[PDB]
Design an enzyme around this catalytic site. Structure first.
Site, PDB file in Angstrom:
ATOM      1  N   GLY A 106       0.803  -1.226   0.000  1.00  0.00           N
ATOM      2  CA  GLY A 106       0.000   0.000   0.000  1.00  0.00           C
ATOM      3  C   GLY A 106       0.829   1.266   0.000  1.00  0.00           C
ATOM      4  N   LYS A 138       4.092  -0.415   8.462  1.00  0.00           N
ATOM      5  CA  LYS A 138       3.714   0.891   7.931  1.00  0.00           C
ATOM      6  C   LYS A 138       4.815   1.876   8.264  1.00  0.00           C
ATOM      7  CE  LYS A 138       0.136   3.240   9.637  1.00  0.00           C
ATOM      8  NZ  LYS A 138      -1.245   3.786   9.738  1.00  0.00           N
ATOM      9  N   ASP A 150     -14.675   7.415   9.100  1.00  0.00           N
ATOM     10  CA  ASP A 150     -14.261   7.239   7.704  1.00  0.00           C
ATOM     11  C   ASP A 150     -14.322   5.774   7.266  1.00  0.00           C
ATOM     12  OD1 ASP A 150     -13.475   8.043   5.161  1.00  0.00           O
ATOM     13  OD2 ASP A 150     -11.391   8.415   5.695  1.00  0.00           O
TER      14      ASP A 150
HETATM   15  C1  LIG Z   1      -4.109   3.099   6.911  1.00  0.00           C
HETATM   16  C2  LIG Z   1      -3.453   1.788   7.265  1.00  0.00           C
HETATM   17  N1  LIG Z   1      -2.636   1.655   8.269  1.00  0.00           N
HETATM   18  C3  LIG Z   1      -2.214   0.390   8.322  1.00  0.00           C
HETATM   19  C4  LIG Z   1      -2.809  -0.313   7.309  1.00  0.00           C
HETATM   20  C5  LIG Z   1      -2.606  -1.748   7.015  1.00  0.00           C
HETATM   21  N2  LIG Z   1      -2.760  -2.210   5.753  1.00  0.00           N
HETATM   22  C6  LIG Z   1      -2.566  -3.478   5.440  1.00  0.00           C
HETATM   23  N3  LIG Z   1      -2.748  -3.966   4.161  1.00  0.00           N
HETATM   24  C7  LIG Z   1      -3.016  -3.276   2.969  1.00  0.00           C
HETATM   25  C8  LIG Z   1      -2.852  -1.904   2.759  1.00  0.00           C
HETATM   26  C9  LIG Z   1      -3.128  -1.348   1.523  1.00  0.00           C
HETATM   27  C10 LIG Z   1      -3.582  -2.135   0.448  1.00  0.00           C
HETATM   28  C11 LIG Z   1      -3.819  -1.500  -0.883  1.00  0.00           C
HETATM   29  O1  LIG Z   1      -3.477  -0.326  -1.017  1.00  0.00           O
HETATM   30  N4  LIG Z   1      -4.329  -2.202  -1.938  1.00  0.00           N
HETATM   31  C12 LIG Z   1      -4.493  -1.645  -3.295  1.00  0.00           C
HETATM   32  C13 LIG Z   1      -5.929  -1.313  -3.703  1.00  0.00           C
HETATM   33  N5  LIG Z   1      -6.516  -0.207  -2.936  1.00  0.00           N
HETATM   34  C14 LIG Z   1      -7.950  -0.171  -3.261  1.00  0.00           C
HETATM   35  C15 LIG Z   1      -8.643   0.914  -2.440  1.00  0.00           C
HETATM   36  C16 LIG Z   1      -7.995   2.265  -2.726  1.00  0.00           C
HETATM   37  C17 LIG Z   1      -6.540   2.151  -2.295  1.00  0.00           C
HETATM   38  C18 LIG Z   1      -5.876   1.101  -3.179  1.00  0.00           C
HETATM   39  C19 LIG Z   1      -3.710  -3.523   0.657  1.00  0.00           C
HETATM   40  C20 LIG Z   1      -3.437  -4.075   1.889  1.00  0.00           C
HETATM   41  N6  LIG Z   1      -2.222  -4.370   6.363  1.00  0.00           N
HETATM   42  C21 LIG Z   1      -2.066  -4.003   7.626  1.00  0.00           C
HETATM   43  C22 LIG Z   1      -2.237  -2.680   7.998  1.00  0.00           C
HETATM   44  F1  LIG Z   1      -2.069  -2.346   9.293  1.00  0.00           F
HETATM   45  N7  LIG Z   1      -3.598   0.603   6.617  1.00  0.00           N
HETATM   46  C23 LIG Z   1      -4.476   0.323   5.450  1.00  0.00           C
HETATM   47  C24 LIG Z   1      -5.946   0.560   5.830  1.00  0.00           C
HETATM   48  C25 LIG Z   1      -4.064   1.121   4.213  1.00  0.00           C
END
Ligand SMILES: Cc1ncc(-c2nc(Nc3ccc(C(=O)NCCN4CCCCC4)cc3)ncc2F)n1C(C)C
EC number: 2.7.11.24
Length: 348
Positions: A15, A37, A135
């Site tokens: 991400g 992160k 959100d």
């Molecule tokens: C804010 C935050 N703090 C910690 C985390 C966190 N995130 C993950 N896993 C993730 C994170 C991002 C994606 C991704 O970007 N996927 C591509 C499609 N995405 C479709 C929707 C629009 C954005 C693009 C996938 C798995 N694992 C543990 C975590 F603790 N987060 C997340 C919610 C971003």
């Protein structure tokens, strides 16, 4: 660093967004998978630093299977003055619900039921702690390879009272994401509770049922138009509670309209699903079903167990957030959260 002689090995970036950069990683000694992160230049922007602080505090308070958990927060490796980037280690979540909904993956009624169940289970706990997420949307709902759903991104969270010092007290129509934004925020109805989140849940639920966004408005007025095309004209009581005269006058200028039944919006959709959906998507915050009551709805009976859907005690205190703080004082507060994380682990 993340080399052969450090605790973690980076696998790949999963991400990139306003939150920073999330990477999959492994603990080198054990092979255990985690997310890391990086929050780059974390103290440069006051607004962003405040989001970081409130997420750290909230996630440290919570312990629940449907809420993202902090496993580690890396201590500074440089002198205090040079510390600029924060690394948080969390549960590894391979995907988000947005990805899943808007793909060629299966999303049967049973997928919808199970994901909605997990979301509401997390919300019952969070809401009992007097925390409103504000959100909720599919991209903030993380899903792993075990099909476990966890709520993420607590940067926009608030309690049952927000400070008049910040702009979002008055400019409520800019809180969070347009397509999931509760009527009370859009219209400044001066009634800001956990019901905010149940509106967003209704939008997410509809989005899972149709695999397309329920109210994808292009601007402020269009967003209200789309909501009224289904819910009908809001009541005289709701219209009188609208904060802004122009908005109130605009709603009154439109011709009267009755609600469209959810059976017409979603033809052939499951009856109990639509029953629960209708309990979430109401103009009046107080009319909406709670997360706790939703878990008791027949739609979720398959997974519902009142012995395994806990509340959170004690409630979360937002006092720290109402304080007017400089950049450097916020940095100190964030460094203290990191120190406290490790000090508590030493004393257990
Ligand atoms: C804010 C935050 N703090 C910690 C985390 C966190 N995130 C993950 N896993 C993730 C994170 C991002 C994606 C991704 O970007 N996927 C591509 C499609 N995405 C479709 C929707 C629009 C954005 C693009 C996938 C798995 N694992 C543990 C975590 F603790 N987060 C997340 C919610 C971003």
């Amino acid at each position: 660093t993340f080399d052969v002689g450090d605790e973690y090995e980076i696998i790949e970036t999963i991400g990139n967004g306003a939150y920073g950069v999330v990477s999959s990683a492994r603990r080198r000694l054990t092979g255990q998978q985690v997310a890391i992160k990086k929050i780059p230049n974390a103290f440069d922007v006051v607004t962003n630093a405040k989001r970081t602080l409130r997420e750290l505090k909230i996630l440290k308070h919570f312990k629940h299977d449907n809420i993202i958990a902090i496993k580690d927060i890396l201590r500074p490796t440089v002198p205090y003055g040079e510390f600029k980037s924060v690394y948080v280690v969390l549960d590894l979540m391979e995907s988000d619900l947005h990805q899943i909904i808007h793909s060629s993956q299966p999303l049967t009624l049973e997928h919808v039921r199970y994901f909605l169940y997990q979301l509401l289970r997390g919300l019952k706990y969070m809401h009992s702690a007097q925390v409103i997420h504000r959100d909720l949307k599919p991209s903030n709902l993380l899903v792993n390879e075990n099909c476990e759903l966890k709520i993420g991104d607590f940067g926009m969270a608030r309690g049952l009272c927000t400070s008049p010092a910040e702009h979002q007290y008055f400019m409520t129509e800019y809180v969070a994401t347009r397509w999931y934004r509760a009527p009370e925020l859009m219209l400044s109805l001066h009634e800001y509770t956990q019901a905010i989140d149940l509106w967003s849940v209704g939008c997410i639920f509809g989005e899972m049922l149709a695999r397309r966004q329920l109210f994808p408005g292009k601007n402020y007025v269009h967003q209200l138009q789309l909501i009224m095309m289904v819910l009908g004209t809001p009541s005289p009581a709701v219209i009188q509670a609208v904060g802004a005269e122009r908005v109130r006058a605009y709603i009154q200028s439109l011709p009267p309209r009755q609600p469209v039944p959810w059976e017409t919006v979603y033809p052939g959709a499951d009856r109990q699903a639509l029953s629960l959906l209708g309990r979430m998507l109401r103009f009046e915050p107080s009319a909406r079903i709670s997360a706790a009551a939703a878990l008791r709805h027949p739609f979720l009976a398959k997974y519902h167990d009142p012995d395994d859907e806990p509340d959170c005690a004690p409630p979360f205190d937002f006092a720290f957030d109402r304080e007017a703080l400089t950049r450097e004082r916020i940095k100190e507060a964030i460094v203290a959260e990191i120190e406290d994380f490790h000090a508590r682990r030493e004393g257990i």
